[model samples]
Target: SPQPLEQIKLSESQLSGRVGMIEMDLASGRTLTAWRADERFPMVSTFKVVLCGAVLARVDAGDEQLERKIHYRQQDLVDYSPVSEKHLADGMTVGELCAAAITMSDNSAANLLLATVGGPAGLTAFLRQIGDNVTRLDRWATELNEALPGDARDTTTPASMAATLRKLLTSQRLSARSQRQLLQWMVDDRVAGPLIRSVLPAGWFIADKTGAGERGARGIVALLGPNNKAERIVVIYLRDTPASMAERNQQIAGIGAALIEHWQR
Candidate 1:
């Protein structure tokens, strides 16, 4: 009786900001907290999570090898891409690219990996095939052709992303070992520093992935709780209103951390 009653209201005042949040005890799909969570936003680097899943899924099915070598073609490079200049003219294993795409949010690595998984359409097909139709991947990791118009990348809802995280946490569909691999990759690729690593317990094992495009930001934080309790947590923040990346990141961290502390207590 005192558990819920003893809760603290840690949320900051709404600062005319965009915020999308979702949290669940993945084992039972129980929501501990949420707000503006059903909205859609550009995933930015967070889309790497999708690419990582597709690549790993293919490997698990024996369709691809992690050690296979792939290179970044000129068409894959974008001006803002961090991987473009760094890895140019260098050859690396698919495994390394996958890690960079996840951990470092490497743009070229992500596009190259996405191409292997049949580009954006393949990811869409993969999600549907797995009964995860809410998540969306409209463009390749580095495609900015808003000029063409009528393109279809804005599909993933916050609820579905939360659901996706929950599935990863509790379901037996993916082999336990495979689940660990993906989780570990996310932990290694952890970015969006403000909300993910900073919000949770000091020493908790959190496997999270972050994405931010323009002012839109998203994070999927999966915590291995005390005694190894698992929780799938998500936050997706987007804005049509202009906002600096730093401003948005701090707000996300504030919201995410508050929820984590409130729920854990």
Candidate 2:
């Protein structure tokens, strides 16, 4: 039975911005959406998932090797990157860079990989090839402040982002090995604590990418699996949340619990 998607209300909580979310069953191709799931929102770090897919697509094509090394020049360094700060002098393999990009959400590593795969243009082409035509990666993380004005840094709709996740889960894009590796990075993500993982039950799994934007723009796109059954891809995008961080996090957790309960029943 499909449950009704209710509007989430939080005491002392008001969201000045909009939110978009979707839950899709990989086995049946059915979905549930809330808010403006079809509308675009800032992707932030979640865009890295597509970047990872693009790199792996090359690997699956036998054009790139994971073990191949990419040097880290001074210009490749970016702020807010713990991974690049530590590995400044030493270079990392393609596989290592990819891991750091997702697991740590390292901006520098993402840029390096994006450049390796042909910048935003190349990423867009790969995304189109994989049937994710609506998501856009316009600028590198470091250039966000300098790039196109307005809310156009990187954008994606909940439906399109969910579709991308479905492609990975259903093995429509990457090879099994690539899919497994990519999911592993997402599972090991360090910054996804406040998103869907916050309320999921023990023994359940989440392979996800979390993003943080200015002025309470926080969201996540994840492949969630309850221990009792198969996996489903879930996406939540929030913007202009006026509540305190703690309150907003609680709201998100409550939403997750409700969604999970609805589906599990």
Candidate 3:
């Protein structure tokens, strides 16, 4: 049996738990449609995708070596991590850090990489290098969120962040080879415990990053649906819900299933 289509009820200021869906028909050179995609949201870990882009951009520019070693300092550890204490107090290569951050969603690794690449201050410059300024990295991590006088996490609109991913997919900003590598890494590897992961079918090559925050109790769940075929990148952000992880994950998965059914051939 098919689930009924979700009723979209929203106002200019009442789009809580809103979703942004875009289907770019690259072969046809057309964007199919978008719902509330122009609306902005706290990006959470989806920002990591931009970070990956920055790293790859640096690699493409021949300014940074991915294999270069970078250390994870004691200050990087947080309470929620299994890698805590184990992966901490050890030096890892840039590639290792990227894997840990991107694949494992390791906060410590992410901040370490962010700082090694020059911290929140230099991220804007890195974004500009790729001809994109939509996604910004305002703060380093949650642990250090209060340390800086005015430090705060960044925000991104759905369309802009989706466009950045599309740019990476099309190899406009990075070389074809580099783009492929990045996508492959994203698809094959990611910290697999989020709404997006919950919704995806087993064995589906779903490349995505999941993120949430306390202020909003939100999650940025993006799915590179059906993997490398470039079908359409679906980004659904479930926010402000009192639902538990299981409940939200199920809802997110249901939404994804609906979207996939609507678009998939």
Top candidate, metric TM-score: 2
Question: Which residue pairs in model 2 clash with each other?
Answer: none
Q: Pairing residues by index, what is the TM-score of model 2? A: 0.88
Give the total clashing residue pairs for model 3: 1
Considering lDDT, which of the candidate structures 1 and 2 is the better prediction for this target? 2
Tens-digit lDDT track of model 2 for 7-111: 444311356556678888866657865557788777878888878888988998999999998778776688777777677677889998888888888889898
Q: Candidate 1, after superposition: displacement of residue 156 in Å? A: 1.3
lDDT, candidate 3, 1-265, per-residue tens: 1321342222112334555555455434255556666765667766666777778778888987888876555766754544434655567777776776667777776776677568876776676665666656777666422222122347565666667777776746788867776776576554664434565565454666777664334444344445545456666554444456655555556555665666543
| lDDT at 91, model 3 | 72
lDDT of 1 by residue, 144-204 (tens): 3221222336446567777765665447656676677777786675454344555556755
CA-lDDT, candidates in order = 0.61, 0.74, 0.60
Order of the predicted models by TM-score, top scorer first = 2, 1, 3
Q: After superposition, how far is residue 210 of candidate 3 from its true place, in Å?
A: 1.0
| Best by the lDDT measure | 2
If both were scored by lDDT, which would come out higher, candidate 2 or candidate 3? 2
TM-score of decoy 1: 0.80
